[PDB]
């Protein structure tokens, strides 16, 4: 609040520009930090190891609990992966699922942005349309690069 | 002169220190706003009867302490730009920022489920 | 004489049950009527005409499409922004303002 109070107080539709600038800068900073981090090879090794561990543990949990579940319905190695490249063991329907969920989550950004900003006063309508489209495509491309 | 020029998208004039001093003395300055990261830039709006009509000047006020009484004496009304409405709008924005994370969580969950079962691929 | 008044007072108390349950059944009827529009033949006719409109609109706007998808950011706005940003930072020397850029 002190943050937003300061940028409202010190610097004709200017405060909204400053606030949008602040929020965009902050989100971009966090995203750039994360991408720059995972751009290191050993960190990719780290995340690959954690992924195979969590996959195996989820498999154990799944077997156990599904078996006890259809029992209640009755009532009523590591190296082959760890030494091979990532994409040859993972199917493509998984990434297609990830992409479909992402798309479905963010597919309403342009309309929300346009409605929020819009209530020579409406000579800015082309600018807000351009901004909506560009921002939506930025989100999609950031998914792509990550 | 004003008779040998074209009207072009009126801009903020510039006054140094004493034209503004004489203007606030003669009783023609109507309002002033302070701004700048260093709390010494002023945007001054004059009133109708003044020579030239209502216009907007920009002045840099060198630190002199007897300015305050000078302005307040001649009825100048010093102002800001933080009227209660923008404060309320800022608090509204902060509230939306507080809510944005759980709503995005529940939306991600709903769409994981809808992508999985309630609307899968046809075969 | 008795049974008729008894069934009448039960009629009235189940009318009470209905009064304490009016908004829920009302909004249920509302969402049912809403879901009723999007299963007619009218709605599939509409979807197919929308398809025709999208086909005609795609055939007349190939240049604008490629502009907004490939050119607008990557080759127009991003390099401008990057150069202006770099020159806003980066103190006023020559090794930093011209040579390393």
């Amino acid at each position: 609040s002190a943050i937003i109070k300061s940028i409202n107080n010190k610097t004709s539709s200017e405060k909204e520009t400053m606030q949008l600038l602040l929020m965009s800068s902050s989100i971009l900073l966090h995203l750039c930090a994360i991408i720059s981090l995972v751009s290191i090879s050993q960190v990719r090794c780290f995340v690959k190891f954690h992924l195979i561990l969590l996959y195996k543990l989820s498999n154990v949990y799944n077997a156990i609990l599904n078996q006890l579940s259809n029992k209640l319905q009755k009532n009523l190695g590591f190296l082959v992966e760890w030494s091979s490249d990532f994409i040859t063991i993972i199917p493509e329907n998984v990434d297609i699922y990830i992409w479909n969920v992402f798309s479905k989550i963010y597919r309403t950004i342009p309309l929300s942005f346009i409605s929020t900003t819009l209530g020579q006063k409406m000579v800015a309508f082309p600018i807000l349309l351009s901004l909506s489209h560009l921002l939506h495509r930025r989100i999609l491309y950031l998914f792509d690069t990550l | 002169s004003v008779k040998t020029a074209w009207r072009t998208q009126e801009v903020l004039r510039e006054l140094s220190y004493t034209q503004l001093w004489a203007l606030v003395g003669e009783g023609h300055v109507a309002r002033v706003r302070f701004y700048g990261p260093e709390k010494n830039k002023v945007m001054a709006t004059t009133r109708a009867s003044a020579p030239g009509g209502e216009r907007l000047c920009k002045v840099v006020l060198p630190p002199d302490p007897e300015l305050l009484d000078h302005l307040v004496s001649n009825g100048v009304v010093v102002d800001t730009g933080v009227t209660e409405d923008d404060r309320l709008r800022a608090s509204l924005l902060v509230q939306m920022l507080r809510y944005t994370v759980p709503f995005m969580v529940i939306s991600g969950l709903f769409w994981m489920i809808h992508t999985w079962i309630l609307d899968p691929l046809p075969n | 004489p008795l049974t008729r008044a008894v069934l009448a007072v039960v009629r009235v108390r189940e009318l009470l049950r209905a009064l304490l349950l009016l908004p829920f059944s009302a909004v249920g009827g509302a969402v049912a009527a809403w879901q009723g529009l999007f299963n007619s033949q009218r709605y599939e006719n509409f979807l197919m005409s929308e398809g025709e409109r999208i086909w005609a609109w795609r055939n007349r706007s190939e240049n604008e499409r490629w502009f907004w998808e490939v050119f607008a950011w990557d080759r127009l706005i991003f390099p401008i922004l990057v150069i202006v940003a770099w020159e806003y930072l980066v103190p006023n020397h020559l090794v930093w303002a011209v040579l390393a850029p």
């Binding site: 300061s6 010190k10 610097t11 400053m18 600038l21 | - | 930072l89």
Partner: peptide, 15 residues
């Protein structure tokens, strides 16, 4: 953030 820094810097009292 370098544009907003002179504005945000008043939360500490500095220039």
């Amino acid at each position: 953030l370098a544009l907003l820094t002179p504005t945000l810097l008043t939360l500490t009292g500095q220039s």
